[PDB]
Amino acid sequence: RVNALEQVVIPGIRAQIRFIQQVLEQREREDTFRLKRIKGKIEAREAEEEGG
Amino acid sequence: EYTGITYISGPLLFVENAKDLAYGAIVDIKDGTGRVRGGQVIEVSEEYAVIQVFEETTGLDLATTSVSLVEDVARLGVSKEMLGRRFNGIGKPIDGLPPITPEKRLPITGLPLNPVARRKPEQFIQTGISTIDVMNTLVRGQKLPIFSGSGLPANEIAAQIARQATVRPDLSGEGEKEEPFAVVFAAMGITQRELSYFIQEFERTGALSRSVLFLNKADDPTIERILTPRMALTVAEYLAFEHDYHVLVILTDMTNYCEALREIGAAREEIPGRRGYPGYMYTDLATIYERAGVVEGKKGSVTQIPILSMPDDDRTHPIPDLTGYITEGQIQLSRELHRKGIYPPIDPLPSLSRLMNNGVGKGKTREDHKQVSDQLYSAYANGVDIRKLVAIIGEDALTENDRRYLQFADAFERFFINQGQQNRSIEESLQIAWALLSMLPQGELKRISKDHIGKYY
Amino acid sequence: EYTGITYISGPLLFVENAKDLAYGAIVDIKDGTGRVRGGQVIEVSEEYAVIQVFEETTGLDLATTSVSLVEDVARLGVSKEMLGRRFNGIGKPIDGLPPITPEKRLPITGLPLNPVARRKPEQFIQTGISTIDVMNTLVRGQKLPIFSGSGLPANEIAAQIARQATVRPDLSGEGEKEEPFAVVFAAMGITQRELSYFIQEFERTGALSRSVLFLNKADDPTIERILTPRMALTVAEYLAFEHDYHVLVILTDMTNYCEALREIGAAREEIPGRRGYPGYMYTDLATIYERAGVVEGKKGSVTQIPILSMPDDDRTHPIPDLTGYITEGQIQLSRELHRKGIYPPIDPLPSLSRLMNNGVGKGKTREDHKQVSDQLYSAYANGVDIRKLVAIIGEDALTENDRRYLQFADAFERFFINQGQQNRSIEESLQIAWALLSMLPQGELKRISKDHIGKYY
Amino acid sequence: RMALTVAEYLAFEHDYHVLVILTDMTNYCEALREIGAAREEIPGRRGYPGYMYTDLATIYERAGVVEGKKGSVTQIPILSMPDDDRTHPIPDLTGYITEGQIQLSRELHRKGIY
Amino acid sequence: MIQGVIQKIAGPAVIAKGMLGARMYDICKVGEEGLVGEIIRLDGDTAFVQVYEDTSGLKVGEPVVSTGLPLAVELGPGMLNGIYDGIQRPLERIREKTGIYITRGVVVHALDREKKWAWTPMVKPGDEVRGGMVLGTVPEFGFTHKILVPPDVRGRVKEVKPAGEYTVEEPVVVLEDGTELKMYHTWPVRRARPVQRKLDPNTPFLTGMRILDVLFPVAMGGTAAIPGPFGSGKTVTQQSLAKWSNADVVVYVGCGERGNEMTDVLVEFPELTDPKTGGPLMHRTVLIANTSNMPVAAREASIYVGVTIAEYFRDQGFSVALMADSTSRWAEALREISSRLEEMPAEEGYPPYLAARLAAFYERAGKVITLGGEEGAVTIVGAVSPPGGDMSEPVTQSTLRIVGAFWRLDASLAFRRHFPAINWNGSYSLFTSALDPWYRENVAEDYPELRDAISELLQREAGLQEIVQLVGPDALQDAERLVIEVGRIIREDFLQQNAYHEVDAYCSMKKAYGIMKMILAFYKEAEAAIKRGVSIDEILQLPVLERIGRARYVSEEEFPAYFEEAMKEIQGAFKAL
Amino acid sequence: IQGVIQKIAGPAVIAKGMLGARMYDICKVGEEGLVGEIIRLDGDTAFVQVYEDTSGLKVGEPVVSTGLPLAVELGPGMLNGIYDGIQRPLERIREKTGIYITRGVVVHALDREKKWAWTPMVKPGDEVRGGMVLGTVPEFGFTHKILVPPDVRGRVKEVKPAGEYTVEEPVVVLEDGTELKMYHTWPVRRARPVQRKLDPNTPFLTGMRILDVLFPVAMGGTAAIPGPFGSGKTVTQQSLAKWSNADVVVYVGCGERGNEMTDVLVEFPELTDPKTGGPLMHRTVLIANTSNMPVAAREASIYVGVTIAEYFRDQGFSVALMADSTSRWAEALREISSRLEEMPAEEGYPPYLAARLAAFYERAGKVITLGGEEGAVTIVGAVS
């Protein structure tokens, strides 16, 4: 059990959280980028009242 | 012919001098490649509009652009006689002869079917795979997606359901062989092998004079991967309901669907909201699946069989997500029985079923597999699960009792789940099933009744 | 008027002549359904403001829109007769008595205390509990979160210990008649049961004649949610610093507060932080736990206790991460205790106060308390590991020492952790301890002094 | 890229062989990433530039042997791993780019081997 | 007036211009066939119209005339027996006047005025009336479907029509206040029917399964919820309130119930007969559910028009069981709003309005006495799913797990034979300290004691479970397999129940009481078996374990005499051996 | 300059009437003069990052600006001197506002109302060397050499005799013109010039055997102590600086705890030096921020101290800087960069985190100055 644990199990049960984490995290680049372009629209709209 | 571009990139165009266009309208256009393409007015605007071309732009100059409102609503000519003929996503016949004359020109958007107009079906069919016709019971007007991984076959298994699809003559207490049985097809993205592979098993089927094929290739535009689905199903509505025939519709490559869905997802205005895919996705998989259902007053039916091909074996992936919820009763394929050489490689241990004592297993559907389904479940489980538990507890450790559990695993799976070119009737199933069930003594066989046991001794 | 409307996305409203109006104001808006609505005036421009309606999102119209500027600065009147009042939410009559009397005006948003005039704790509170007075030691003017789960009920173990608490500082030499006690409860998102279950208990024994209540209903919008802690925080000030009272803030379910915030910020053009939760949180969470503590030269102090909910109690969630820096020490409720039915669920093992020597000292909690706390820690902990060895190898194949360390754990949950709503003193809890420890030989007593062993067994 | 181009001159033309001993590419990614975070090339792949390879292309291009002229230019990248795991782009993308790899692990570090 | 035309038609939504006088969250008439919109934003003379019916031919320059009602629900009789929409349009009228296909721009009466209903007055013309007072009793089947005075309206009577049928539109009581009380009366869907006070829940609701009460108790006047990832048994768990609930008023409403699932479940009610009523099951089911064949924006309306219907019933003085079939569907519909309006929702794919409109739905009605002196109790059960397959998300915490009961499902769990399935540990009930009074007095003074005592054993086995999957038992002892086998029997017979069979479950005190006493017996004796020298192997091989394993098929009526004969066999086949 | 407020979103303010505004410019927004700072300009308006929260501020007010860039203040009074992350004296805040703090507080950054000693260590007609000799202040710590800042090597006139002179009072002026006073202003974002950066070669005592003798980092190291405080770890941090061979200690935190962080402050005069034999308080600079402290207070925290140690370095003192809670420093930065166009892109933190992280260690260590004197800025990185 000792032998086994220090190899396949333990860091493996780690790398699972890590892999998960990183992909959850990276997904939220697209969130911000989209949200950016959303902002751009909103301001662009109130900038046609006062200009072009 | 309206001229004046503002944005062109992909099958989404924007062009001005418009307000005479309606939601869901056939226009035409001119391009610099000297060709006249299509366009559905998917969205409408103040002095422009969003157009969706039925072909990829590979050339379109700003000197020469055009718009001509052909028709206000958007439609396809559909007639009674079009069986025996092949078609494509554009909607031209690929046969080589003049296009048939409509009776109705029905919209391609689809008109939903009333939930009031249906009623519980109960007439079962032979799929030529034992496992289905016992556990889930595939009846008319019911969906049952066959979940398929990526790196897994999808084509192989599909073919088995197409050449061994057949009503019971009176094994259920009746037939529907008295009315013509026919099949409809429509592929949404296919390569070089999948093209011919399907056609040569339809000559096995003996059906190519009574089927309507809406083949969409990958050399065919990517925009017609989501047009064609709706389109196909309107030619289902026409022939099952209004010309009383039991039509089997079989939809495959609902991952190539999802490729095209994604495109409009982010390239249009709308933002992602289903973990990096659209949020109007729901409607896109609703309008598709919810049309199908046996209507009460009609003899005929649209029986839809979705065949997925979803990326890997994730279950958080958009596709299996919504599909799960939608369908009532499901079937899965895995890689447990695809390393053993067992075609089909159906695995019901993680799979689920929600109709098997819900208007099925009772009624004009036999009660002699009623208690069998309930029994097979917890029995098959005892199996598979402990195959895992053995490699922890010991390396060969299994007690008097658990020994029996695992004994019924290897056996059931081999015999039963290898069908393929072998057809088993309702009777042939139950016989064999009970004889593997005699491996467990009385007390695990509590669920089967006194009658059942002797019945199929 | 203030006519001009642009965006009513949800509970937004914009108004022209935003130059008189300011940031951090609160205002009456006039609408044609006759409704009177507050709403803080946020994101002000010289053309456009943002106001956020304290009543629903229905009845806004573009014909009647006006704004009565109340006062630009955040306001809220404070009274010293808040010591037997009862109020829900912001501060609205549930006692039927007037809401406020202006004896002073203080905002709900200021800048907390100098650390040069912050004293440390030196007294103690008795909640009438064991484990949160022995193993972890809460004292007068202390920061200390109670980490609950969402599967677990936050809300019960909150109001239970609420009314139950009666200060006791006899041993220090200060009475209950030279120490007043004021229990401040501020909740949010409570259901129909929880909203009535509280008031009842509070009214039961006297805990509402010597306390003032707050609890923000679930029918109320998410904008009032936020002002709820900031409200009762500012009241706690005017009592303890300026009339010598020792108040106890009990916040209940911090998550709901942070959710709400997120929607205000998203419409105030900011990006949320990690796990999709507010990233502008750090500051706001700080001012609520850092505008408590002791004061130099004033005997009074606000003691801070928040309660939060966590889906699985992990640290992966932002919700504990943030908190856990600004607050000292930790109490956390685990699943194992609660399932079996032990109240409170408090486990002493994940817990540990960071301050137990910088609170009370020797002779103020009896001198033996110190080492008797690190006895019971090691005695318990040993036994929760041989409960999963109670039948593999057994306890009959185990040493004498370890056999006693089993039974010890069991009697610890029964008598020490659990006592329900019964009260206890420092001295009666140390009594329990001794009895349980007599069972262990003097040879197994090594975590106390020779003085302590010869003090009692 | 200065170290690189500079050397190509003296390398081929004057005919002297040199070996460019480049150290931590970590600090490369790190600094690079800031810039694309205000011009909106949106760096990320696992939190490192997704335009990474693009820039490293020219920089590590001269690292073989030319024909004609003698003397050459050879890259020796030197960089740590934040984890043994070859998932994160610090060793992964670097892997693909370059020609094979040589790890020193920690499997012998642990023992006093040097 | 409110007038204008279409500026920009995009998606099911229409963005209008020229809107004058338009008010927030108010019903409209849209296009030229009548599709009915809602003002869900203003920006001066443009207001984003959200159109509940999908668009398909509508274009620029077409009418947009807002009615000026605050999306009012039309309250009156004819609710019982008859399908309706979530947007309230009878489906009976659609099928007969179109065809079998749902087409856009079908507009019919929300509350039929092609019906009349027998009037019995009660109120006298000499009296005054009060908000929340009964004007008479309309007899709708075996139920008593009173007619009440709309809250915030009172006068003095001067006439009251005498008995006869009258159309719901005609008055039946007239007043000196300029008004006429009709059986056709407006109440907003954004404003709740007023209550006299809130009451503390203290009677439990019997949801007639021996695992959705016995182990995790649910309250009457409560709120509860069950989730279900990716079609694990999300739909099936309402076959457990189909008729095994004690409600006198059952409201089945779905945010979106797909086509296939109304081919069996929706047709199930006119094919059944409830035994409590003694009469038909559809008499007592309102039906106001929405299909997914029905447009995406109709899914968003659903919830607020059926919750008020639930209040209308609660007021009369009847137990109301409201259960929103897959409440998860209103979230996608709400979330589509952002896309179309140029906004971006709450991060990680969460809906843009979290707590605000979820907490509101649940707490709208629930354990409240009325103006009119009657006992209102609303039992609401959200049958959500996590869209991404995570049970850790805002919207689960704020109002789907902080309620009376929180439950969970696993995927191979339910497949064995548990339909529906629950996680034994990971599932709790918050309310359980307030459900102890009735259970003490009515059932027995050891019903609260035994139900905590069964739960203890079920969650203590978990102790060993872990070690089994760590390296296993290589030592079987007498104290080992004790907890383990017992617990086995308990999960095998007490949590494997079916909702498709009336022998595997049913609403009955005595079945729950009974079964749980059999298991108590087997348990009791086992502890004193081992001491004497009785191997756990033989404990299996007593036939009495099989007797408790044939209590989950037993006929309901037969159970009393059955139970009494069986309690004796335990105690005889234990103490002997 | 002087301008007018246009918007208020959040704690941040945005105000036009700015033109010819410097970068990292002194801004005192409103008629309340909230301690703020001009940043990234846009158009004829600017974005203004206001540390102190705003909630009384109305738009359209006058905004006074100095028109000179914010700098760190360096003079006497710093040894045995309590200050925060804005660098105001937290106890003269206690006397002039009371126990509680009401925002818009501005007081001098050093004790300038005292009359501080002086002795001339130069004369007229001689030339000064930058970074060294001007005149010393005798104090009750050791000494404190008030030296002229770098690149000022010119001739001096008029050096006044040893006595007592306020910080704002002159004692010296230059012959070539350009006047100077005892208070000196040095840029917050720049570091002073060196001649070599040396190599570390004098061991850094910590006064406990095992710590330094087994694992030395010597004088000019960079170390770390991980794991959160409250494990008795704080034992290590106090005693470290207390015993350790130096002549000045600077203690600094940022986002540190509640009451546990106020135990430290009162127990600080109760720590005792071995060298002087009296309190450590005599020879300790505080710039700690608690967590009730303003938004960007904690974010500016670091930089202050760095600079301040370099002053003592140039003098020929050994300093011992103790960077408590490096991990919690990042909290504020995330918040600020969210509300701007520096949005997250790394992994739950902005990618400008690594940039602001480095410089704190890079600009410290044992090196020789322009003045030719040695001293060290040993850092011990409590990440926590």
Q: What is the DSSP string of E37-68?
A: EEE---BTTB-EEEESSPPSS-BTT-BEEE--
Measured between alpha carbons, how far is C125 from C353 in angstroms, rounded to an integer?
15
Dihedral (C-alpha) E290, E294, E299, E305: value to the nearest 10 degrees?
-50
List the structure tokens of F10. 């959040």
Q: Binding site membership of E: which residues? A: 228-235
CATH fold for domain F71-113+181-384? Rossmann fold (3.40.50)
How distant is the alpha carbon of residue B177 from its chain centre? Answer: 23
- Show Cβ contacts of residue F231 under 8 Å, excluding neighbours closer than 6 positions: none
Q: Which residues of E265-302 are buried (b: 16+ CB within 10 A; e: fewer)?
A: bbbbbeeeebeeeeebbbbbbbbbbbbbbbbbbbbbbb
CB contact under 8 A, D33 and F345: yes
Contact B324, B330 (CB under 8 A): yes
CATH fold for domain E72-114+182-429? Rossmann fold (3.40.50)
Angle at E65 between CA E59 and CA E70, to 5 degrees: 125
Beta bridge partners of C88: C92
Other C-beta atoms closer than 10 Å to the C-beta of A42 total 13
Task: Could you list the beta-strand ranges (E) of C173-297.
Answer: 181-186, 188-190, 211-213, 216-217, 246-251, 293-295
**CATH class assigned to E115-181:** mainly beta
Q: What three-state secondary structure class fits D1?
A: coil
Residue in the structure block whose two tokens are 């969210």: F338
List the structure tokens of C37. 């609505």
- Give the nearest partner residue to A33 out of D42, D45, D47, using CB atoms: D42
Where do the structural domains in chain C lie, given as residue ranges? Answer: 1-457
Measured between alpha carbons, how far is F361 from F359 in angstroms, rounded to an integer?
5
| Cα separation values, F91 from B49, F82, F101, F114, Å | 67, 7, 11, 15
Contact C236, C117 (CB under 8 A): no
Chain F hits for C295, CB-CB cut-off 8 Å, are 99
List the structure tokens of E169. 């539109």
Any alpha helices (H) in F141-268, and if so which ranges? 209-214, 234-243, 260-267
Measured between alpha carbons, how far is F47 from F49 in angstroms, rounded to an integer?
7
Q: Give which of E519, E429, E503 is closest to E204, Cα–Cα.
A: E429
Q: What three-state secondary structure class fits C384?
A: coil
Tell whether D106 lies on the interface with A, counting CB pairs under 8 A.
no
Q: Give which of E476, E496, E487, E483 is closest to E551, Cα–Cα.
A: E496
- Here the contacts of B266-272 (C-beta below 8 Å, separation 24 or greater) are B267/B9, B267/B10, B267/B12, B268/B12, B268/B43, B268/B50, B269/E339, B269/E342, B270/E339, B270/E340, B271/A34, B271/A38, B271/E338, B271/E339, B271/E344, B272/A30, B272/A34
How far does the CA of residue E416 sit from the closest CA of chain B (Å)? Answer: 4
Q: Give which of C350, C247, C262, C348 is closest to C305, Cα–Cα.
A: C247
Q: Give which of C156, C121, C119, C153 is closest to C137, Cα–Cα.
A: C121
List the structure tokens of E472. 């296993």
Other C-beta atoms closer than 10 Å to the C-beta of F308 total 25
Query: What single DSSP character describes residue C208?
Result: S
Measured between alpha carbons, how far is E417 from B333 in angstroms, rounded to an integer?
21
Measured between alpha carbons, how far is E365 from F232 in angstroms, rounded to an integer?
53
Contact C139, C360 (CB under 8 A): yes
Contact F38, F21 (CB under 8 A): yes
Q: What three-state secondary structure class fits D20?
A: strand
Q: Give which of C339, C399, E334, A4 is closest to B391, Cα–Cα.
A: A4
Sign of CA dihedral F56, F62, F64, F70: positive
Contact F364, F302 (CB under 8 A): no
Measured between alpha carbons, how far is C302 from E77 in angstroms, rounded to an integer?
57
List the structure tokens of B225. 């991967």
Contact D4, D73 (CB under 8 A): yes
What kind and span of H or E run contains B230?
helix B224-232
Measured between alpha carbons, how far is F74 from B323 in angstroms, rounded to an integer?
69
- Show Cβ contacts of residue E16 under 8 Å, excluding neighbours closer than 6 positions: E4, E5, E6, E7, E46, E47, E48, E49, E64
Sort B442 into a burial class: Cβ within 10 Å, 0-12 / 13-18 / 19+: exposed
Question: Does a cis peptide bond (omega within 30 degrees of 0) precede residue B344?
Answer: yes
Q: What three-state secondary structure class fits B51?
A: strand
How far does the CA of residue D97 sit from the closest CA of chain A (Å)? Answer: 23
Total residue length of chain E: 577
Sign of CA dihedral B52, B53, B56, B59: negative
CB contact under 8 A, F259 and C22: no
Measured between alpha carbons, how far is C56 from C53 in angstroms, rounded to an integer?
7
> If contacts are CB pairs under 8 Å, which of residues 270-309 in chain F contact chain C?
290-292, 294-295
Contact E301, E295 (CB under 8 A): no
> If contacts are CB pairs under 8 Å, which of residues 23-52 in chain E contact chain C?
23-25, 41-44
List the structure tokens of F143. 């000494």
- Which value in Å is the resolution of this experimental model? 8.7
Contact C382, C405 (CB under 8 A): yes
Tell whether B276 lies on the interface with A, counting CB pairs under 8 A.
yes
List the structure tokens of C432. 């329990």
Q: What three-state secondary structure class fits C53?
A: strand
Residue in the structure block whose two tokens are 């006929």: E555
CB contact under 8 A, D37 and F347: no
**A18, A22, A30, A35: best mutation site toward chain C, by most C Cβ within 10 Å?**
A35
Beta bridge partners of B293: B302
**C26, C111, C136, C301: best mutation site toward chain F, by most F Cβ within 10 Å?**
C111
Measured between alpha carbons, how far is F137 from F183 in angstroms, rounded to an integer?
13
Measured between alpha carbons, how far is C408 from E93 in angstroms, rounded to an integer?
73
Query: What single DSSP character describes residue E97?
Result: H
Contact E570, E525 (CB under 8 A): yes
CATH 3.40.50.300 in chain E is located at 72-114+182-429
> If contacts are CB pairs under 8 Å, which of residues 299-318 in chain C contact chain A?
316
Any alpha helices (H) in E494-576, and if so which ranges? 509-532, 536-540, 545-548, 559-575
Chain E hits for B288, CB-CB cut-off 8 Å, are none
Measured between alpha carbons, how far is C313 from D90 in angstroms, rounded to an integer?
33
How distant is the alpha carbon of residue B325 from its chain centre? Answer: 14
- Show Cβ contacts of residue E529 under 8 Å, excluding neighbours closer than 6 positions: E539, E574, E577
Measured between alpha carbons, how far is E464 from E472 in angstroms, rounded to an integer?
9
Maximum C-alpha span of chain E? 92
Beta bridge partners of C304: C143, C249
What kind and span of H or E run contains C301?
strand C298-305
Q: Quick one: how many helices (H) and strands (E) in chain A?
A: 2, 0
| Cα separation values, E498 from E237, E244, E493, Å | 10, 12, 11
Question: Does a cis peptide bond (omega within 30 degrees of 0) precede residue E201?
Answer: no
Tell whether F374 lies on the interface with C, counting CB pairs under 8 A.
no
| Cα separation values, E274 from E248, E249, E506, E507, Å | 11, 12, 12, 12
List the structure tokens of C234. 């500012």
Contact B267, B12 (CB under 8 A): yes
Q: Give which of F106, F104, F107 is closest to F61, Cα–Cα.
A: F104
Measured between alpha carbons, how far is C88 from C45 in angstroms, rounded to an integer?
33
- The CATH code for residues F114-180 is 2.40.50.100
Total residue length of chain C: 457
What kind and span of H or E run contains B177?
none
CB contact under 8 A, B271 and A30: no
CB contact under 8 A, A29 and D44: yes
Question: Does a cis peptide bond (omega within 30 degrees of 0) precede residue B102?
Answer: no
- Show Cβ contacts of residue D103 under 8 Å, excluding neighbours closer than 6 positions: none
Measured between alpha carbons, how far is D97 from D58 in angstroms, rounded to an integer?
11
- Show Cβ contacts of residue F323 under 8 Å, excluding neighbours closer than 6 positions: F252, F302, F360, F379, F380, F381, F382
Contact B64, B30 (CB under 8 A): yes
Contact C131, C417 (CB under 8 A): yes
Question: CA-based Rg of chain B, rounded to a whole angstrom?
Answer: 25
Measured between alpha carbons, how far is C393 from E471 in angstroms, rounded to an integer?
14
- The CATH code for residues C1-457 is 3.40.50.12240
Phi, psi angles (nearest 5°) of residue B415: -60, -75
List the structure tokens of E183. 């059986």
Sort A1 into a burial class: Cβ within 10 Å, 0-12 / 13-18 / 19+: exposed
| Cα separation values, E52 from C129, E30, E352, Å | 57, 10, 19
Measured between alpha carbons, how far is F294 from C290 in angstroms, rounded to an integer?
12
Contact E196, E408 (CB under 8 A): no
| Cα separation values, C59 from E39, E40, F292, Å | 11, 11, 40
Amino acid at F268: F
Measured between alpha carbons, how far is B370 from F142 in angstroms, rounded to an integer?
96
CATH 2.40.50.100 in chain F is located at 114-180
Using what technique was this structure determined? cryo-EM
Maximum C-alpha span of chain A? 73
Q: Binding site membership of F for ATP: which residues? A: 227-234
- Give the nearest partner residue to A38 out of B271, B275, B276, using CB atoms: B271
Question: CA-based Rg of chain E, rounded to a whole angstrom?
Answer: 27
Contact C312, C321 (CB under 8 A): no
Beta bridge partners of E90: E84
List the structure tokens of B303. 């029986």
Measured between alpha carbons, how far is C301 from C120 in angstroms, rounded to an integer?
10
Q: Give which of F333, F264, F332 is closest to C328, Cα–Cα.
A: F264
Amino acid at B395: E
Chain F hits for C19, CB-CB cut-off 8 Å, are 59-60
Residue in the structure block whose two tokens are 């998960």: A20
Measured between alpha carbons, how far is C415 from C429 in angstroms, rounded to an integer?
10
Q: What three-state secondary structure class fits B231?
A: helix
Architecture of domain E430-577: Orthogonal Bundle (1.10)
CATH 1.10.1140.10 in chain E is located at 430-577
Measured between alpha carbons, how far is E234 from E227 in angstroms, rounded to an integer?
7
Measured between alpha carbons, how far is E298 from C450 in angstroms, rounded to an integer?
77
Contact E190, E307 (CB under 8 A): no
Contact F52, F28 (CB under 8 A): no
| Cα separation values, C129 from C122, C125, C246, Å | 19, 10, 19
Measured between alpha carbons, how far is E479 from E475 in angstroms, rounded to an integer?
11
How distant is the alpha carbon of residue E261 from its chain centre? Answer: 17
Task: Please spell the DSSP secondary structure of B122-135, one letter per residue.
Answer: --BEE-S-TTHHHH
Residue in the structure block whose two tokens are 């103040």: B46
List the structure tokens of E61. 């320059």
What kind and span of H or E run contains C378?
helix C375-383
Angle at F253 between CA F248 and CA F256, to 5 degrees: 145
Sort E118 into a burial class: Cβ within 10 Å, 0-12 / 13-18 / 19+: middle
Question: CA-based Rg of chain F, rounded to a whole angstrom?
Answer: 21
Residue in the structure block whose two tokens are 């034994």: E424
Chain E hits for A31, CB-CB cut-off 8 Å, are 344, 347-348
